[PDB]
């Protein structure tokens, strides 16, 4: 049941890096304290996405064995997993890091900004769906690492090296599932199942981003999202 010393080192690295930085309270505070129409919704989206890129690059760099991959493979995993890792981090903030009742207010403001709801409703539905699994901080951080270290990506040259990197993380997650949800043997499969919904967001991310454009993304965001 218990994590061995090697598994503890992997988990310490992931947990320390995941919780090192926090999304500034003032970015989320602008939504309720300042005018929030389509234009402000677009600008705040850009600031938040920029924060995700800054956090996830730092996190990805501290992933056990990530630096055993060549620079081109490192970039491919970063770009390949970006959308999925962003939604997982947003889901954790939305579900567990906001003041009581603020998640409903932030949802209200986005739904009333003017931006098309085509991709907004499935995003909030995803947050609600993962929110019912009552995930721990460990589970969110490990799922994020597992998403990044996916050997399935369109672009990855050394798939077997990535598979070997992801394997011990899946093992840690399986152990954590057994320790905290012993009554539910399918908990591990349920967690992983929620990643298929993220893959669809990733697959259609260019159309989704298009739907959020107000009459323009920053250079860093254009690079990570291929837009």
């Amino acid at each position: 049941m218990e994590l061995t010393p090697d598994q503890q080192t992997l988990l310490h690295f992931i947990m320390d890096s995941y919780n090192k930085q926090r999304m500034p309270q003032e970015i989320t505070n602008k939504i309720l304290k300042e005018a929030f129409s389509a234009e402000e919704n677009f600008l705040i989206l850009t600031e938040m996405a920029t924060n995700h890129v800054q956090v996830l690059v730092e996190f990805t760099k501290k992933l056990p064995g990530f630096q055993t991959l060549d620079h081109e493979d490192q970039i491919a995993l970063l770009k390949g997993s970006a959308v999925e890792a962003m939604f997982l981090r947003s889901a954790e903030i939305f579900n567990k890091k906001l003041p009581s009742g603020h998640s409903d207010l932030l949802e209200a403001r986005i739904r009333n900004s003017g931006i098309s709801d085509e991709y907004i409703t499935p995003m909030f539905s995803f947050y609600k769906s993962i929110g019912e699994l009552k995930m721990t901080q460990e589970e969110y951080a490990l799922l994020t690492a597992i998403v990044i270290l996916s050997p399935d990506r369109q672009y990855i040259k050394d798939r077997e090296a990535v598979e070997k990197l992801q394997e011990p993380l899946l093992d840690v997650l399986q152990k954590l599932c057994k320790i905290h949800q012993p009554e539910n043997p399918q908990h591990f499969a349920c967690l992983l199942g929620r990643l298929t919904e993220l893959r669809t967001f990733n697959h259609h991310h260019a159309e989704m981003l298009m739907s959020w454009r107000v009459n323009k993304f920053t250079p860093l965001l254009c690079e990570i999202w291929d837009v």
Partner: peptide, 12 residues
């Protein structure tokens, strides 16, 4: 080099 490469390769 790209912005992503500059950030990824920046020594920790």
């Amino acid at each position: 080099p790209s912005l992503l490469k500059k950030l990824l390769l920046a020594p920790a």
